[PDB]
Amino acid sequence: RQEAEQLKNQIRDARKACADATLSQITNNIDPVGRIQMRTRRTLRGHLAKIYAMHWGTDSRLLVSASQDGKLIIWDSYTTNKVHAIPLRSSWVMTCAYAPSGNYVACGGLDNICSIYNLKTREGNVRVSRELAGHTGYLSCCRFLDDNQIVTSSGDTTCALWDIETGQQTTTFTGHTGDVMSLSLAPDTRLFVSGACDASAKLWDVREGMCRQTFTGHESDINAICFFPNGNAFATGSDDATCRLFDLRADQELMTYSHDNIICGITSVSFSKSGRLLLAGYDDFNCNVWDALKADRAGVLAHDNRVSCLGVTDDGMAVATGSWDSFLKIWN
Amino acid sequence: TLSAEDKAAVERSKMIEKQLQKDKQVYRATHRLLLLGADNSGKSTIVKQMRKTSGIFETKFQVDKVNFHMFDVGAQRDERRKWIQCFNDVTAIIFVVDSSDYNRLQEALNDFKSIWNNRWLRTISVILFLNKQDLLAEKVLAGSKIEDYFPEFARYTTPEDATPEPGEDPRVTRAKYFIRDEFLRISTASGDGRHYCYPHFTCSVDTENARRIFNDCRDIIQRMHLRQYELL
């Protein structure tokens, strides 16, 4: 145990003896974006209970949402039309994902099961095609790699890589102490980051199924994790009204985005197409847009209840926000 | 919408909105309940009497043409504060205690303290069930005491307005109401008049728990409405 602490001190010291200059010193010589005005352009209605998750499609037009009454709805964001309405076996759903090819959707919650729904059948109905079982805790997140591979996060401190064709886990990702809350994929789908309630974030390798790096610094647990468009940075969000931005290669903590006027925690985080903006949904009914380079508050997206999820279109077109009052708003 | 296909899409959306309306009226007339308890408590037998590693279980019972949905949380971890945020909209919480062990009581007390003082559990009233009372009666007449665990039991008298059973032995009563108070002391120290507690004395062979839940729910909703209309 004594040796362990040594090592940890060696690792710290190695990290310490690298911070020659913070982001602010370099970035203090760039003109800011200034003020950004975003207006509500659409309003999607039809959900009964609170909304827990949403996910944009690569088509940049369709999106899927999940609510606590046990319903999945697929919208058309241009004409405000509804394409599909899917009921769930269990009403306590917590997450949903949309396939990159637009062929499948997934969901899960307080039932230890991840369900797969096929959207393209000969019959004009949506039916479940695979139920993934084996987790001990509730499912908190899920993301498709392709039409055959999916990564899930559970409340049993473990992650897993599944095989939809057979339904058996091919890799188990153990090591977290507390239950895991969120995960994020990489553009090349060779790595993924994950954050848990033990106030630590870890980087995993999909092929070798092994932990690679660890990040610390957050005072409270982690609720939402996002990834930089370039591929080398990722930003988190905690319950202590703070969000950071950690590098991969540098292995440290960069500029911190927080203010003294916020007491409530963060629920969702997302990035802009260029990485010039950082938007996060807070518990004070509001959404805060920040300058990702200078830690400047620029714009507020002002919902009558808690904001639960966010989403930015692939081409930077617009932003969709969900909330606990069962309304979806599109800002452009 | 100036094409035939667009009109057909709008029509499909309209059908979807009519299905969602019937779902909403079905939904508005149901009351949701959450059941919490330990392994020694007979919570697993009350569900049986009323009626794989899964995560949650459901049970439906009807009284006076009113539907009640009780959700029992199954195979989960030992941490509760994270998934308890999804139940801030239920009518009431049923808490089952096996107060016939003399050992497994303090942990139940801290459990009750943690549940009652939760942030996300405000406005939610709790119905207290005291189970396996006949075992307590069989464990007290022989004389395993209570003063060795609770030293203040020796300074407790039967409260003034208690009602004993008809075939009651004098002794049993003192212990039952001591446990009931011990549980009731926790609720009265906080809440500032937004939720209440409804204790009971439940046995293994009972056929009235549904009626008690109905009455407690009726009282809770009536009190909620009276406060809302500035009458309380």
């Epitope: 088509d59 037009r61 369709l62 058309d76 039309n81 394409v83 599909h84 637009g102 000969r122 019959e123 004009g124 109905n125 | 100036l2 094409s3 035939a4 296909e5 667009d6 009109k7 057909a8 899409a9 029509e11 499909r12 309209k14 059908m15």
Partner: single-chain antibody, 233 residues
């Protein structure tokens, strides 16, 4: 997924018949239904249309007060009611599925049809350049279609279809909305156009590509077809 049609027969003039199409194997209560006519020596022609919710109904301008459509969801049966059979209703009638949402592929599955022998305007005009062409098994083929009004819509869609009924079976779907490929068709067909004139190209050539190719527009409701170009190998 299979549909069955019933009725048919020979009807004396002035009679009335009840033609029907029966669905089975899918969610029939979510698909719009059409009826399409086809004379023995002419191309296809659209008859009527009923929607999934029975709230919308169209009829062809030729017959609007004579025919009548109805549907039954609990039994999955579609009906066509014909009265005062003239000397023209001597063609083949087909029942066609269709479902309308974003990204969908209407006019996908056709039935098998029936026969009916009878004893003795401002709509878009769609025409095809030729009627037949001789080719070789392995060369490139190009079939042209033209319209009288611009099929391109303000949204960005071009409502043009290719069907290519084979010599002996019911029609199927090759290209929908002038650019997109059907589900099970081989990946050697393609389509292109500019807004008024369109072409269908077949890169390779197999023995299964013989038949008559059709050109249909779905901009307005009349639903006018083309003429047809037979290929002989």
């Amino acid at each position: 997924v299979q549909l069955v049609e019933s009725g048919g027969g020979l009807v004396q003039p002035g009679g009335s018949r009840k033609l029907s199409c029966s669905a089975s194997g899918f969610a029939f209560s979510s698909f719009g239904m059409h009826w399409v006519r086809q004379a023995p020596e002419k191309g296809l022609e659209w008859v009527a249309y009923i929607s999934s919710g029975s709230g919308t109904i169209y009829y062809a301008d030729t017959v609007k007060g004579r025919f009548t459509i109805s549907r039954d969801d609990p039994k999955n049966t579609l009906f066509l009611q014909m009265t005062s059979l003239r000397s023209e209703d001597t063609a083949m009638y087909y029942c066609v599925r269709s479902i309308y949402y974003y990204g969908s592929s209407p006019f996908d599955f056709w039935g098998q049809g029936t026969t009916l022998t009878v004893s003795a305007s401002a709509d878009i005009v769609m025409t095809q350049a030729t009627s037949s062409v001789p080719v070789t098994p392995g060369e490139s083929v190009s079939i042209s279609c033209r319209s009288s009004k611009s099929l391109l819509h303000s949204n960005g869609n071009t409502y043009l279809y290719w069907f290519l009924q084979r010599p002996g079976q019911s029609p199927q779907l090759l290209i929908y909305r002038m650019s997109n490929l059907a589900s099970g068709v081989p990946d050697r067909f393609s389509g292109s156009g500019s807004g008024t004139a369109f072409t269908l190209t077949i890169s390779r050539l197999e023995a299964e590509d013989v038949g008559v190719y059709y050109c249909m527009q779905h901009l307005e409701y009349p639903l006018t077809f083309g003429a047809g170009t037979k290929l002989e190998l």
